[PDB]
Amino acid sequence: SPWFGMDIGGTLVKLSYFEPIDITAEEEQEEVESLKSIRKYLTSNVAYGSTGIRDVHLELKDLTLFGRRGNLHFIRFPTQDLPTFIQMGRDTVLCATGGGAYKFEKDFRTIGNLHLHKLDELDCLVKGLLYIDSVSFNGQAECYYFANASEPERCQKMPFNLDDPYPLLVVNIGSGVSILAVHSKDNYKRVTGTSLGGGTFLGLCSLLTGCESFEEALEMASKGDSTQADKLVRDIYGGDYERFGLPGWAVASSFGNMIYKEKRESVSKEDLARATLVTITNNIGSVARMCAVNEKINRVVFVGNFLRVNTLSMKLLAYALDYWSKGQLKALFLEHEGYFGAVGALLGLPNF
Amino acid sequence: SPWFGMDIGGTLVKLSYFEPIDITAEEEQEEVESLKSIRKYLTSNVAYGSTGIRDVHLELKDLTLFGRRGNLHFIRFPTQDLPTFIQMGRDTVLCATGGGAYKFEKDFRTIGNLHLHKLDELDCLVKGLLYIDSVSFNGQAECYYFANASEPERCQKMPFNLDDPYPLLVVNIGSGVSILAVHSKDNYKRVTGTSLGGGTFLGLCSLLTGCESFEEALEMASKGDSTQADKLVRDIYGGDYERFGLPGWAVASSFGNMIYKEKRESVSKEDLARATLVTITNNIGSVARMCAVNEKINRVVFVGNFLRVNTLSMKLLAYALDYWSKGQLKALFLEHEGYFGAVGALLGLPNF
Ligand SMILES: Nc1ncnc2c1ncn2[C@@H]1O[C@H](COP(=O)(O)OP(=O)(O)NP(=O)(O)O)[C@@H](O)[C@H]1O
Ligand SMILES: Nc1ncnc2c1ncn2[C@@H]1O[C@H](COP(=O)(O)OP(=O)(O)NP(=O)(O)O)[C@@H](O)[C@H]1O
Ligand SMILES: N#Cc1ccc(N2CCN(C(=O)Cc3ccc(C4CC4)cc3)CC2)nn1
Ligand SMILES: N#Cc1ccc(N2CCN(C(=O)Cc3ccc(C4CC4)cc3)CC2)nn1
Ligand SMILES: [Mg+2]
Ligand SMILES: [Mg+2]
């Protein structure tokens, strides 16, 4: 059987695939044709069908896993297209996590003799995150932060060492947000969550702007000015609110200037997209800050695909977490941020 | 001079007016005609102009204040109409709080010889809240909670005693949200705030539904089904997420079902209004919960005008705070919830 791990989320399916590269002459002979066809299909294409994508830049090359050498591949497609995936499969042991491992369990069992092993979506996350950081990103750091995030002329991506990763607050921004406190490799809990996550960004953006994709929403947001929609502290006070150290630029009311009909009539789609992004990103940062203070954890790592190709939100989180915590908290990011559940599921294979 | 206190917020101006009722025969003679005209104007009308309203049901009758007996009146109008108010005044000591006491300071000084005394918006809140609870609501409790908030056949408003009110978490839901921790009558701090408040509800509702007022937004929300817009835990898992005690009905992603074009095309305005209300209310509850746990405070009182004529949000807060805290936190409400800053400002009059 090929070695897969799958994370079926509310929005995206993430698949980690281990491609062996130490196949001997004898092993090749015993390779059944359906299996050779899968390996060739996966390694010679970067787009699969109309909606599947291999993230080639994330490939881990010449990894030793389960006593074999191979390449670790990272693939994603929309959960809405899981029926296509399962139909391809009907034309072997699957370790699966995410809510969809439960929701679609009966559908995976339509593949004859398939053994589905459901693994918990946050257990897999912790195991996958720790594993990828430990093996490194082809010799480079898996984890990074934004140095001098408050000064745009200085702000830059820099590596961060996690060789002793505990304790760690993990903020998983998917459709919603789960917040985990990780005290050791076997001692972690889900602190809380928030419903204002990546699905809120995408869903509200689509309602407000008519954008047709995540990438289009980000494109619009990059051109917009959120202060056309948001009411700032300076809109209420005329300046800073000095008594409580609130700068005039801080958002007092997200979308709060949209209570005025004339402002609704002048605001652009791009402004609304940027206000949606800023509202969601600041709320995630603030909740993370409150949880870090309560858990007595000062390293906060953000994962999940809300942040893929989303440097705006990453830089906003880096700045906001640093600013509003007075430098006590540090925002961390991971190169493989959307795939840790899929990797953790793959790592469960030896238990079956 | 008449005895006023004013709280000029980002959205509403709140005015507390003390009407003396122990005017002697001699005092009446010395009553200057402009002053008699103000008192008659205020006490014989319940609507002022097109946008001012006296909340007659909140009047405190036969209150002793500053050694005189009188009635305490509660009046509100939109901050957008403050120019009309100031123009009426130009056709005496004003204790004023809220951001507008700073933003509009120069405008109040266009009233000749007027003395404007700016007081801090959260200091006034604490003083006004403690004062009104102490004098009672015409012999009835100022503070109330929802008994058995989880069972709709039982859920009912019941009085709550605050004779020893400390400590107290005060959640002020105006345009945005300020969270205060009150340890004594002179020891209180602003813990944090969130930008997702009443202005977010009203602004997003107006963008999404075309509603023209707060009351219309609430009317639409009362008819809607937020689960048409929100992605629930059961939409992702097919049921409860048992491992972490998440019920299937919990919202996993606010507006998360609006990433699907066909769902955007079937959702009603009423559904969107209700989803906006639920999203904002749950976020306020969750932030309050996290702050209460960090501050080691188990009584959480919600104030501000987001909750005026808004039993939906009050009941949602009562249920959610109780459910998600496993009964450790209690949601409290106050009959005069939008006016405490205005009262606290009035109480500053003897210092000038
Ligand atoms: N191609 C894409 N399509 C859709 N959403 C995308 C895409 N790229 C990034 N996103 C964002 O990524 C989020 C989904 O992140 P992801 O971590 O994959 O969540 P999920 O696992 O599917 N959901 P959950 O069940 O809550 O864990 C979306 O809500 C978007 O904000
Ligand atoms: N008649 C109304 N007009 C507008 N908003 C209303 C009205 N009635 C209730 N609201 C709600 O009440 C909120 C304003 O509450 P309020 O406590 O008066 O805030 P504010 O003091 O003006 N703002 P802030 O400067 O942030 O303290 C609005 O955002 C609405 O959600
Ligand atoms: N990472 C991270 C992170 C990101 C944001 C964040 N904020 C906490 C602080 N804040 C507020 O208080 C908002 C607010 C200001 C004024 C008022 C009213 C007095 C007029 C109400 C509400 C903004 C959000 N905290 N942490
Ligand atoms: N008062 C008050 C109050 C109100 C709400 C509240 N919630 C905290 C708990 N919660 C979540 O975790 C949301 C969520 C669920 C699942 C997932 C993903 C696994 C698929 C992500 C996110 C809902 C909001 N807490 N307190
Ligand atoms: Mg996920
Ligand atoms: Mg206010």
UniProtKB/Swiss-Prot annotation, chains A, B:
EC number: 2.7.1.33
Effect the entry attributes to changing residue 9 to V: Loss of catalytic activity
Enzyme class: transferase
GO BP: any one term: coenzyme A biosynthetic process
Active site (catalytic residues): 121 (proton acceptor)
Gene Ontology molecular functions: acetyl-CoA binding; ATP binding; pantothenate kinase activity; protein homodimerization activity; vitamin binding
Keyword set includes ATP-binding: yes
Pathway(s) where this gene product acts: Cofactor biosynthesis; coenzyme A biosynthesis; CoA from (R)-pantothenate: step 1/5
Highest taxon of the lineage: Eukaryota
Function description: Catalyzes the phosphorylation of pantothenate to generate 4'-phosphopantothenate in the first and rate-determining step of coenzyme A (CoA) synthesis.
Protein's name in the database: Pantothenate kinase 3
Organism of derivation: Homo sapiens (Human)
Name of the coding gene: PANK3
